Amino acid sequence: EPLYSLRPEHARERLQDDSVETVTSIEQAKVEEKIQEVFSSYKFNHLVPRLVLQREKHFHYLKRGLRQLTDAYECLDASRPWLCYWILHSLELLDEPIPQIVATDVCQFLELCQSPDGGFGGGPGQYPHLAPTYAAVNALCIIGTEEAYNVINREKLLQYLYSLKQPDGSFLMHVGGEVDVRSAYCAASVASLTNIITPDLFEGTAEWIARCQNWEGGIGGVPGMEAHGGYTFCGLAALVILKKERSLNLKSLLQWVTSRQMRFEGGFQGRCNKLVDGCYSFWQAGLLPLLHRALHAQGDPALSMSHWMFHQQALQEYILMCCQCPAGGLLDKPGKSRDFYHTCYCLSGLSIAQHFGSGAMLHDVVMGVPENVLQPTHPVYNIGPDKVIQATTHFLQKPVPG
Amino acid sequence: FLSLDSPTYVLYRDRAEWADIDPVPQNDGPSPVVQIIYSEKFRDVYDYFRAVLQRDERSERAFKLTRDAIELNAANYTVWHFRRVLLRSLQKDLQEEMNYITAIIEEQPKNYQVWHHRRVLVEWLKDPSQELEFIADILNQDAKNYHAWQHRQWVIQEFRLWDNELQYVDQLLKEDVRNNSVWNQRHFVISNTTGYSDRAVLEREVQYTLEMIKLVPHNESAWNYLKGILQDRGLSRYPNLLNQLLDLQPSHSSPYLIAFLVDIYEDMLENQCDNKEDILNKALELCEILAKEKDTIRKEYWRYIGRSLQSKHS
Ligand SMILES: Cn1cncc1[C@@](O)(c1ccc(Cl)cc1)c1cc2cc(C(=O)NN3CCOCC3)cc(-c3ccccc3)c2o1
Ligand SMILES: CC(C)=CCC/C(C)=C/CC/C(C)=C/COP(=O)(O)OP(=O)(O)O
Ligand SMILES: [Zn+2]
């Protein structure tokens, strides 16, 4: 039949615990039984399955969240630029225009979030932090207006980045804060897009990132830690920005990420022997377009001309059948509550899985109804490719601060 | 201290000892975006936090206030920074603060700020005496908490507490041999102590891993560990490996065994092996079975491997 995870052979993909039960197998079995139910729901109810991205429902969810949130979001009071980014990117992916009045409002809000020291805080008056700084910059770029670009104080941003730089090449997330590969990516992301990369800003960074790659092939938060999709994405993406992808054993990395796709569920897990999760549809699967671009630069002649090195169809089936909340918004896995973070990354991942692109080639795979197709997203920044080029060219019109 | 959950809790605007201070409301601008309709309790605590932050009042009451702001949102790193300022400025007993962070981490272990705060306290006190035991209790509740393992690695490395970690690793491996965090910790301990060059150690490890594979053929962690400690110098450096894996193939087969065999064929085909046209086809047939039957979820990956193996070994 047309759907991969509903075919009878697929049943063979269920977990084999070798009759040796542990917390890991038991927990992986619970989720598989839960996912199977979703897959079998169509046969059970005697209906023909149809995969439809509830674009309308998600839109309402997004449009409302962009303006107001209940006290349930109190835990994100220090992550508001993140909310701006997650929502605007989702709408962007769903190809929904952002009213000029909303855009200016977002711009003014992020201005209040900007610190006199440079960088952005999680809210008005909060100290600058690299995560919300990455979020603010990405949001402003998604808007892409002269107004939005001008919100960013490029001179102060550079100063802030330097205040976080460590001797070993890594960056603090914020002053007096912790360090992990996220900071390298956030710094490289905002510094590149706004053209403030000085000759020594990222000295040693590429090397520090390469030290995070471990025996697994993936990348950990800091040297010595377990390989994880979120950190591996930050690491590679950061290296692609610095043009040092070569610093990594790309073959061991490629083998690790591809193994992170769940044979049964269809989605990805964040690390070996853990559970599948819709947001990793971007963090993990998003690494394939990066490796594809990295390998091709080295002249790899075996790379496909139409597909990324992961089951695009299965990831789309997982997202569409298991990660949509009927009320709008997307999620981790069935049974979990919706949130804007998962909405942003489940859609980002869907985009990746349905759009291939390698130079002159272009190939799509849109599972379910054709209206499911979303706007493409750039694998490094996770904002529209056009917004990247537009923002990049814009900031190139000015010199790197001194 | 008046618990934020206490039945007699009173908003700060209704507290006498705070009457002198005018709270500072949050300025979201004329037309708010992603505006959160905070509860009265939240908005009340933060309006006074903003007041104490603006005036930079380093007082005992402000210190107590940060505790409530943290409880309402442990992710607010700005509050955590001010709290550390107060700890220094007020000369607060740091072990008391250690008991405090121990309690909050038990409550919210998946938070970046709480662990970093603990790190700063340990760094300040130059005292890791409670760490291994505390981390162990957190790991006993979530054996895979990333922050917990990260904190454990940091403590062990900074204070050189290596002596008992491998034993700990064996303990947790016995509890769940599929715990990838424990296998990572295993590689962490060994590579920073004896290393993997001592042949006695490398053999010991490979035998243990192979044995774990025999016990649970489908546990990807053991397979990844075995591959990880051998791909270093190259799989073809160990001839006995190939046949030994082919031996347990009739019974202990898994798409992982097939994949490992392929990993050996490509290293061999890269280090001048005999019959470099006979081994190549063995691999391509395996890439075929993998992409078509035994591991189709990775069909695109396996088809790439085949194409790359021919692209240079034909
Ligand atoms: C490991 N993991 C895998 N899936 C999710 C996670 C997560 O634990 C995680 C930890 C650390 C990192 Cl760096 C990334 C992801 C995580 C959960 C989560 C929920 C919300 C969220 O919006 N939750 N809502 C809040 C309102 O009520 C409904 C649930 C927002 C964020 C969030 C993400 C990034 C920045 C700021 C915030 C969340 O993050
Ligand atoms: C740009 C940016 C900020 C990227 C980072 C994205 C990201 C998802 C990082 C993961 C961090 C983490 C502590 C995971 C462990 O959580 P868990 O054990 O609850 O999740 P798991 O079981 O799925 O591994
Ligand atoms: Zn998730």
Tab-separated table of C-alpha atoms in Angstrom, chain A residues 4 16-18 20 22-25 65-71 73-75 77-78 80 83-84 105-106 109 112 121-122 124 126-127 129 176-178 180 182 214-216 220-222 224-226 231 251 254-255 258-263 271-274 300-304 307-309 311 314, chain B residues 26-39 42 46 53 73 75-78 81 84 112-113 116 144-146 149-150 153 175-181 183-184 187-188 215-221 224-225 227-228 231 255-256 263 266 294-301 304 307-308 311:
chain	number	residue	atom	x	y	z
A	4	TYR	CA	5.270	2.687	4.431
A	16	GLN	CA	13.169	-7.432	19.773
A	17	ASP	CA	14.253	-7.330	23.409
A	18	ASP	CA	16.009	-10.713	23.233
A	20	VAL	CA	16.086	-9.497	28.401
A	22	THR	CA	15.368	-3.409	31.204
A	23	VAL	CA	13.976	0.073	31.699
A	24	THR	CA	15.099	0.940	28.181
A	25	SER	CA	13.351	-1.901	26.335
A	65	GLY	CA	0.246	32.695	20.434
A	66	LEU	CA	2.131	35.450	18.603
A	67	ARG	CA	0.052	37.935	20.557
A	68	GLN	CA	-0.989	36.388	23.844
A	69	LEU	CA	-0.266	33.422	26.096
A	70	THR	CA	-1.823	31.994	29.273
A	71	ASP	CA	-0.010	31.656	32.610
A	73	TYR	CA	3.834	29.992	29.583
A	74	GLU	CA	5.261	31.502	32.772
A	75	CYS	CA	8.106	28.974	32.431
A	77	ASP	CA	9.115	34.171	30.585
A	78	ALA	CA	12.896	34.114	30.024
A	80	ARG	CA	10.268	35.262	24.711
A	83	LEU	CA	8.505	32.312	21.169
A	84	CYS	CA	8.806	35.030	18.524
A	105	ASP	CA	5.444	45.126	16.941
A	106	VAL	CA	7.808	42.149	17.033
A	109	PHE	CA	9.491	44.043	21.454
A	112	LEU	CA	13.228	46.170	24.535
A	121	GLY	CA	17.793	38.814	26.827
A	122	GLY	CA	14.837	36.478	27.280
A	124	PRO	CA	12.687	43.264	28.595
A	126	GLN	CA	16.841	40.587	31.228
A	127	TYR	CA	20.586	40.054	30.838
A	129	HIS	CA	21.959	35.356	26.635
A	176	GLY	CA	28.819	33.962	34.506
A	177	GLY	CA	26.951	31.192	32.695
A	178	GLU	CA	27.627	27.673	31.386
A	180	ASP	CA	28.346	23.826	25.651
A	182	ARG	CA	24.997	25.479	21.649
A	214	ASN	CA	32.952	11.184	20.469
A	215	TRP	CA	33.391	7.433	19.958
A	216	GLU	CA	29.775	7.295	18.780
A	220	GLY	CA	28.145	15.861	22.784
A	221	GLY	CA	27.435	19.096	24.649
A	222	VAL	CA	31.024	19.332	25.863
A	224	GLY	CA	33.465	13.675	26.792
A	225	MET	CA	29.666	13.707	26.747
A	226	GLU	CA	27.230	11.376	24.983
A	231	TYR	CA	24.238	19.283	20.096
A	251	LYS	CA	31.774	9.338	7.995
A	254	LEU	CA	26.848	10.248	9.045
A	255	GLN	CA	26.597	6.674	10.287
A	258	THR	CA	21.270	7.741	10.144
A	259	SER	CA	21.130	5.151	12.936
A	260	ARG	CA	19.112	7.636	14.998
A	261	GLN	CA	16.027	7.141	12.834
A	262	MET	CA	13.634	4.666	14.441
A	263	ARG	CA	13.002	1.639	12.217
A	271	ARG	CA	20.474	9.691	21.244
A	272	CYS	CA	21.027	5.939	21.146
A	273	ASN	CA	18.581	3.761	23.076
A	274	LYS	CA	16.214	6.641	23.864
A	300	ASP	CA	31.995	12.745	-3.061
A	301	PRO	CA	30.721	11.028	-6.226
A	302	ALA	CA	28.281	8.635	-4.541
A	303	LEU	CA	25.781	11.222	-3.252
A	304	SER	CA	22.192	10.866	-4.482
A	307	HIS	CA	17.118	12.214	-1.757
A	308	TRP	CA	18.680	12.971	1.636
A	309	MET	CA	20.302	10.007	3.385
A	311	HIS	CA	13.821	7.770	4.968
A	314	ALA	CA	8.772	7.529	7.040
B	26	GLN	CA	7.347	44.917	33.248
B	27	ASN	CA	7.406	47.119	30.164
B	28	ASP	CA	6.271	45.101	27.132
B	29	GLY	CA	5.598	48.257	25.127
B	30	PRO	CA	2.306	49.703	23.771
B	31	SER	CA	1.396	46.721	21.531
B	32	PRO	CA	2.685	43.551	23.237
B	33	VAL	CA	3.813	40.441	21.395
B	34	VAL	CA	3.965	36.928	22.937
B	35	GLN	CA	2.561	38.571	26.069
B	36	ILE	CA	2.083	36.168	28.950
B	37	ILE	CA	-0.946	36.728	31.168
B	38	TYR	CA	0.883	35.912	34.396
B	39	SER	CA	-0.927	34.855	37.550
B	42	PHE	CA	3.960	35.536	39.453
B	46	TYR	CA	8.647	39.683	39.584
B	53	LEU	CA	17.352	44.573	40.513
B	73	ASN	CA	10.607	30.130	36.906
B	75	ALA	CA	14.846	29.100	33.868
B	76	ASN	CA	15.219	32.785	34.601
B	77	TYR	CA	19.033	33.008	34.416
B	78	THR	CA	18.968	36.726	35.267
B	81	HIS	CA	22.881	35.730	38.449
B	84	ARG	CA	24.946	34.655	43.081
B	112	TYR	CA	20.376	24.164	32.791
B	113	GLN	CA	20.521	26.869	35.445
B	116	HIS	CA	25.399	25.452	36.634
B	144	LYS	CA	19.992	9.122	31.604
B	145	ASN	CA	19.779	12.750	32.777
B	146	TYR	CA	22.197	14.549	30.465
B	149	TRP	CA	26.141	12.855	33.582
B	150	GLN	CA	27.734	16.102	32.364
B	153	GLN	CA	32.179	14.096	34.252
B	175	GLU	CA	20.880	-2.566	36.003
B	176	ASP	CA	20.352	-1.707	32.317
B	177	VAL	CA	22.930	-2.812	29.780
B	178	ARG	CA	21.125	-0.666	27.199
B	179	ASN	CA	21.942	2.624	28.980
B	180	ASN	CA	23.904	4.530	26.340
B	181	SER	CA	24.902	7.126	28.930
B	183	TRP	CA	28.515	3.111	27.922
B	184	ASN	CA	29.618	6.665	27.228
B	187	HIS	CA	34.599	5.122	27.474
B	188	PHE	CA	35.083	8.344	29.445
B	215	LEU	CA	23.393	-11.782	25.937
B	216	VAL	CA	21.384	-9.098	24.113
B	217	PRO	CA	22.088	-9.337	20.344
B	218	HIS	CA	19.840	-6.367	19.596
B	219	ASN	CA	21.327	-3.866	22.063
B	220	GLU	CA	22.783	-1.199	19.776
B	221	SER	CA	24.871	0.322	22.563
B	224	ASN	CA	28.376	0.965	18.907
B	225	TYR	CA	30.883	0.695	21.782
B	227	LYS	CA	32.843	-0.353	16.883
B	228	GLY	CA	33.981	2.798	18.669
B	231	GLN	CA	37.609	1.763	14.377
B	255	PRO	CA	20.939	-5.764	11.349
B	256	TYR	CA	23.757	-4.518	13.594
B	263	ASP	CA	32.310	-1.896	8.349
B	266	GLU	CA	35.407	-1.476	3.819
B	294	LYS	CA	16.998	-6.228	7.077
B	295	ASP	CA	17.288	-2.433	7.542
B	296	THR	CA	15.162	-0.547	4.998
B	297	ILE	CA	14.654	2.543	7.163
B	298	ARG	CA	18.245	3.362	6.169
B	299	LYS	CA	17.906	2.287	2.513
B	300	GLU	CA	19.211	5.647	1.286
B	301	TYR	CA	22.283	5.316	3.507
B	304	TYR	CA	25.110	5.274	-0.727
B	307	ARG	CA	27.818	3.199	-4.582
B	308	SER	CA	30.846	4.523	-2.695
B	311	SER	CA	33.340	4.066	-6.754
